[PDB]
Symmetry: C3
Subunit: 267 residues, 3 copies
């Protein structure tokens, strides 16, 4: 695979393209355990590869082969799991997700620079996916935001953890619970997106970032380490949020459930 | 007794209107020892009442029956207590003052939703009261701010705490000590007031807040709990701060007290 | 030494002008070892004096007699200690540099109000020294910024610590790593500079800040102490960061150190 990885070990730059399968497949780009298990899987793999090769300031890019970035949780999965009373299975998929994004935010245990290239809409966990990377390149016109609150849920993964890095807890809460969508221009204003480049120019934008980020390889390494004893979010602290998140999905009434199923027909 | 409590159990919405004792009495719409004792004790009342009711995301509004939200602490008690040199009974007032705003900040130990309706002016303690609530609705052209520096004191009720949730702690320091005043629209552009509507229409827009918020009671509950880890202001930290405030106010000379009775006299 | 000291003990105001031995000597308005050692040593001196006097809310101003405020750390001492590889002594430089900016932050352990007077450009360690003070007064058309990133270093004598007090730590990091210079006017927009005034009214605006502050000695002391319960950057947390900084400095290659020689000669 569901991932269209791209290796480039001469420059130490690795481009992960999501929904590699959907080129030949029905639809619903989102965070299905297939994709969630492939990103995690690759992450350990390039985590030890780059660690063993002692690569100083590797780059990792998260991107997408679909027409959008990512839609969020696999919605049909939720309904199934919530209905069967299977919280164990739900918590598990949540935890896999936290592990997934936390790696971009922690530079794969290799103090990498993780860039996000958002060429299409990035709702829900897709926005969490996008806020985990260090540098957020979006296109003009893209729409971002998290509408999970229209089903009486919220964005349990990071989001309150990654948003609190650019803004205050009150406003992070507001963005979460207000359930409003936003354009890249707006998100640049709120400092929630790092650089918005013109139509279709986002590909070479991340190329520009790589050129300059590689100019300061020792400095980037001390930053990541310095955040890591100061403001970087601990892994086990995100784990507690999903516990809270998984018990919240587990109480989701039928009215909300039909609404998810409402989004299932047309997701 | 000093509070006019409109409470409706079928909707689980509860309004606390302060200063109702002063519709025929002369004035001082401030944090009179009785007003603090009442506000806190009623919180304790609704406190187990809602916990036994197992209510989920209940709403509590705090508002004013006077022409001002509040005028802050009761400068007459301060003068008299400072003069007698008795921090024992002065610290008691401060603590009971901290227990009232922290209840609103804690959602009353039932993860409630706090909304302050700021119809009048809110000064010092009054302005902190507004700041402890999760939502701040105010009417156009209202003044908020803390002039507690005019007598070489600082707002120790809970301002530092509830400010650093919306704005950087350095800016928190400036606003407190600068002793200035801001109109409600300005405070909106600072992240200090969330909603701002024309005059008269405050109760309406609290009502629109309660509607939308009662639409997602699980997400609210989650946020309360998510906040409760890290984010939320502890109660021992707030206890320490007033213990500093009490020691400071104990060192006040007859100069400051003169300014105090000036303020009492100009309100 | 290496400084001018305008003592004013009846006012409990004290002026520390750096680069006194610059009207008569060569140049390099930077943070030479002696200077850092003279700024520490006088802190201990003034500080024990103020403490033993039982002073309340003193005032220490940091200002420059050279053409600029301070160009920051001594690159000429680093093209030596890195090439020679004496890590022990290099750490010693940063440790004393850290103690130096931190005393200003912490009011010299006497709850004193530090104020930076930015007559001229303040780059690198100069910008940290500035940000370390509680108040920053700067003239029009002055540049401040962190250029050290241009030769693959990172600001590690305080930058992260004192920046995050004013803005988001994702803004802090962007500001360091970008290595841009910002004009005083726009910096004060960014919340970083406190007070922007015309050229010449250097002591003019500082002189007023001193006036307003002693108008409220007791509140300053209280607010100073509250920032000690939970908002003061801990001394040991700052030592830990220097360890990264010097461990970054040993890994510099002739590419970087060549540029520092070029920088040393331009100043």
């Amino acid at each position: 695979p569901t991932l269209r990885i791209t290796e480039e070990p001469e420059r130490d730059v690795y481009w992960i393209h999501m929904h590699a399968n959907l080129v030949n497949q029905p639809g619903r780009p989102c965070f299905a355990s297939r994709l969630v298990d492939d990103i995690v899987d690759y992450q350990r793999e390039l985590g030890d590869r780059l660690s063993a090769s002692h690569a100083l300031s590797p780059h990792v890019v998260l991107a997408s082969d679909s027409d959008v970035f990512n839609l969020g949780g696999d919605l049909e999965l939720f309904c199934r799991l919530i209905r069967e009373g299977d919280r164990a299975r739900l918590l598990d998929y949540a935890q896999r997700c936290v592990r997934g994004v936390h790696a971009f935010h922690a530079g794969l245990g290799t103090r990498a620079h993780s860039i996000a290239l958002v060429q299409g809409n990035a709702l829900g966990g897709g926005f969490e996916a996008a806020l985990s990377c260090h540098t957020i390149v979006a296109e003009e016109g893209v729409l971002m935001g998290l509408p999970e609150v229209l089903f009486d849920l919220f964005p349990g993964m990071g989001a309150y953890s990654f948003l609190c890095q650019r803004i205050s807890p009150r406003l992070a809460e507001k963005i979460m619970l207000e359930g409003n969508l936003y354009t890249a221009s707006q998100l640049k204003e709120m400092g929630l997106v790092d650089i918005v480049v013109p139509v279709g120019e986002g590909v070479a934008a991340v190329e520009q970032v790589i050129k300059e980020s590689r100019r300061i390889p020792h400095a980037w390494a001390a930053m990541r380490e310095v955040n890591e004893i100061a403001t970087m979010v601990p892994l086990h602290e995100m784990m507690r949020i999903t516990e809270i998140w998984v018990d919240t999905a587990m109480q989701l009434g039928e009215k909300s459930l039909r609404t998810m199923d409402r989004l299932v027909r047309a997701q």
